[PDB]
């Protein structure tokens, strides 16, 4: 089984979360392809993958905005091949702001409208992800056993 993980991370929290996810999947037998949103092209990006995990941090504060590297991919999500694709989302945020991990809802909602199958509720991490390594591994385990 092939799984693709694309993450948008500026201070490295969502990136750390992605690597933690990759390990879990990799150990469970998956062939994981983890890429930084900054280095990918939307066009047919999900082609050939059995599972796609999208991670992205939230910004803007006074409004909901996605991590800059992920925006291009988001704006072109209709060209990724999400139709019937088994996907799940995650991201890091800070409850101190008004819209906690809003980036995760935005991606989930658009993936849903594009015909993707969200196999698990998004992983929403508050603060340092390392302090939540247990929730991350479990979430990865959960999505993995629900495809
Ligand atoms: C200007 C600014 C705005 C932010 N807005 C939000 C927000 O709306 N919602 C949220 O959950 N976190 C918000 N955060 C917190 C970040 O999402 C948090 O620092 C996160 O760990 C960043 O992840 P990064 O390393 O993965 O990409 C904001 C941080 C800054 C500096």
Mutate to test the pocket of ligand 1, among 37, 56, 92, 101 (most ligand atoms within 8 A of CB): 92
Ligand 1, pocket-test mutation among 93, 100, 129, most atoms within 8 A of CB: 93
Smallest CA-to-CA distance from 55 within 95, 10, 88, 97 is with 88
Q: For a substitution probing ligand 1, which of 18, 56, 58, 69 has the most ligand atoms within 8 Å of its CB? A: 58
Nearest CA among 14, 34, 12, 13 for reference residue 23: 34
Smallest CA-to-CA distance from 125 within 91, 79, 102, 86 is with 91
Q: Please tell me the residue having the least CA distance from ligand 1 atom 28.
A: 59
Q: Is 38 in the pocket of ligand 1 (CB under 6 A)?
A: no
- Judge if the beta carbon of residue 93 lies within 6 A of ligand 1: yes
Q: By CB neighbour count within 10 A (0-12 exposed, 13-18 middle, 19+ buried), where does 131 fall?
A: exposed
CA torsion 49→132→130→138, rounded to 10°? -40
Burial classification of residue 41, based on how many CB atoms lie within 10 Å of its CB (0-12 exposed, 13-18 middle, 19 or more buried): exposed
Cα 60 from Cα 56, distance rounded (Å): 13
Assess whether the C-beta atom of 102 lies below 6 angstroms from ligand 1. Answer: yes
**Please, which contacts does 63-66 make with residues 24 or more away whose CB atoms are closer than 8 Å?**
64/99, 64/102, 64/103, 64/106, 65/103, 66/8, 66/103, 66/106, 66/107
Domain limits, the chain: 1-147
Q: Which residues contact 102 (CB under 8 A, 6 or more apart)?
A: 58, 64, 93
Bridge partners of residue 123, in order along the sequence = 90
Q: How far apart are CA 60 and CA 124, in angstroms?
A: 17
CA distances from 64 to 58, 59, 76, 98, 106 (A): 7, 6, 18, 9, 9
| Per-residue CA distances from 62 to 12, 41, 58, 97 (Å) | 22, 29, 11, 8
Question: Class for domain 1-147, per CATH?
Answer: alpha beta
C-alpha to C-alpha distance for 48 and 66, rounded to whole angstroms: 26
Q: From the CA of 28, how far away is ligand 1's center (Å)?
A: 31
């Amino acid at each position: 089984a092939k799984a693709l993980i694309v993450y948008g991370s500026t201070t490295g929290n969502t990136e750390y979360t992605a690597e933690t996810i990759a390990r879990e999947l990799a150990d469970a037998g998956y062939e994981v392809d983890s890429r930084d949103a900054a280095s990918v092209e939307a066009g047919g990006l999900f082609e050939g993958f059995d599972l796609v995990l999208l991670g992205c941090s939230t910004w803007g504060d006074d409004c909901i905005e996605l991590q800059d590297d992920f925006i291009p991919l988001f704006d072109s999500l209709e060209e990724t091949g999400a139709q019937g694709r088994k996907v799940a989302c995650f991201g890091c945020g800070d409850s101190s702001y008004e819209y906690f991990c809003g980036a995760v809802d935005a991606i989930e909602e658009k993936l849903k409208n594009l015909g993707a199958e969200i196999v698990q509720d998004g992983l929403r991490i508050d603060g340092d992800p390392r302090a939540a390594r247990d929730d991350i591994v479990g979430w990865a385990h959960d999505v993995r056993g629900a495809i």
